[PDB]
Structure 1
Amino acid sequence: AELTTLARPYAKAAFEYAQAHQQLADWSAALGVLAAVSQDDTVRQLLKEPQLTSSAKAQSLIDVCGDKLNAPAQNFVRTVAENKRLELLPTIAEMYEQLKAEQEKSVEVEVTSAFTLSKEQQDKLAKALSARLSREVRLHASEDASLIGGVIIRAGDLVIDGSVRGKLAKLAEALKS
């Protein structure tokens, strides 16, 4: 079973409560704090001890976060701890943001090129992708010298490759096959 399989019930419950009560931004901050705090070298050790009870592990994590957890978020941490799932907090935060992004019709697109592209080109790629996908696009542009020229677009599981490296690979496979 993948960590994503185990985190799905919890991320979905947290998302539906946050959505129904208009708290989407509060839970986004709370789950992000819990994901970061539970990954700390001292907290990671404390959560794995065999002598501590589920409620002692939950209270220790709530006391450390304090100000960042409202009554519903504190109740959620006590629920994750009772079911012995505190190791899933980083995955629960990741899956909550995916449900939020899909609800808010938003897409984060990674982009890579051989050498830098202008704002005029980024805004031309952004309107083209937003018109194709029917979503708000956030271009995380970057460079990779492994490309001989052109650009590669990664809109989640969808990939659009217009780079020269991809064309050279197609030719190598065409001649070798």
Structure 2
Amino acid sequence: AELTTLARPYAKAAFEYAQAHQQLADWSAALGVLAAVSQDDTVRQLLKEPQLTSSAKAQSLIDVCGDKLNAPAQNFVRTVAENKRLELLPTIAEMYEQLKAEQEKSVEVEVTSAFTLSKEQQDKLAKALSARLSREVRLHASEDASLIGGVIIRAGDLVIDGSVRGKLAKLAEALKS
């Protein structure tokens, strides 16, 4: 099944807990650190051995993170290890932020301009994008030299394109049909 399907119970559990105890920022750091540690080639190799018990694998991971995990996070790590799901930690870390973002009423947009970048330009659109989405917007601008002239705005599944490449595509299908 999709890693997302397998990570949905664990992530919702972390979030309902962080929310009822006011820890929505502490768990973000803890899950990001746990996800990070598990991906390392030495730790990846260790977690895939038949010699270690579930408790031994769980313990070894809490020891590397240490203070980064509060009492509750370490216990969550023990639950994930007991169920043999330590390969889903990057996915579990990702879905937690999504539930949190819908709670905080915010979005991480991913703007891509052709050849220009200005502090005035980012806010000019963050007002309309915020107004449209009804959420606070954490723009993440970047560079896309591929485009002749314009910008491509991605937020969630919505993609507001105002790039000349987009107008080229339209003009081209229109002319060949």
With the shorter chain as reference, the TM-score category is over 0.9
The aligned runs of 1:113-152 (5 Å cut-off) are 113-152=113-152
SS at the partner of 2:138? strand
Moved more, 119-128 or 7-16: 119-128
Q: 1:27 Cα deviation (Å)? A: 0.6
CA distance in 2, matches of 1:122, 1:90: 30
Output one character per residue of 1:126-177: Cα deviation in whole Å (capped at 9) or x when no partner: 1010111110001111111111101110012100011100000111111223
Output one character per residue of 1:73-108: Cα deviation in whole Å (capped at 9) or x when no partner: 111000000000000000000000111111000101
The aligned runs of 1:31-70 (5 Å cut-off) are 31-70=31-70
CA distance in 1, matches of 2:114, 2:32: 34
CA distance in 2, matches of 1:70, 1:119: 39
SS at the partner of 1:110? coil
SS at the partner of 1:22? coil
CA distance in 2, matches of 1:117, 1:39: 34
Q: 1:118 Cα deviation (Å)? A: 1.8
CA distance in 2, matches of 1:123, 1:68: 35
Q: 1:14 Cα deviation (Å)? A: 0.4
CA distance in 2, matches of 1:108, 1:70: 27
Alignment partner of 1:3 is 2:3: yes
Structure 2 unaligned regions, length at least 5: none
Q: TM-score, normalised by structure 2?
A: 0.97
Output one character per residue of 1:113-133: Cα deviation in whole Å (capped at 9) or x when no partner: 111232222111010101111
CA distance in 1, matches of 2:29, 2:145: 36
SS at the partner of 1:51? coil
Percent identical across equivalent pairs?
100
SS at the partner of 2:108? strand
Output one character per residue of 1:14-61: Cα deviation in whole Å (capped at 9) or x when no partner: 000000000111111110110000001111111110111111100111
The count of corresponding residues between Structure 1 and Structure 2 is 177
CA distance in 1, matches of 2:130, 2:171: 31
Structure 1 unaligned regions, length at least 5: none
SS at the partner of 2:128? helix
CA distance in 1, matches of 2:13, 2:149: 45
Alignment partner of 1:106 is 2:106: yes
SS at the partner of 2:139? strand
Structure with more strand by fraction? 1
Structure 1 segments, 4+ long, off by >3 Å, are none
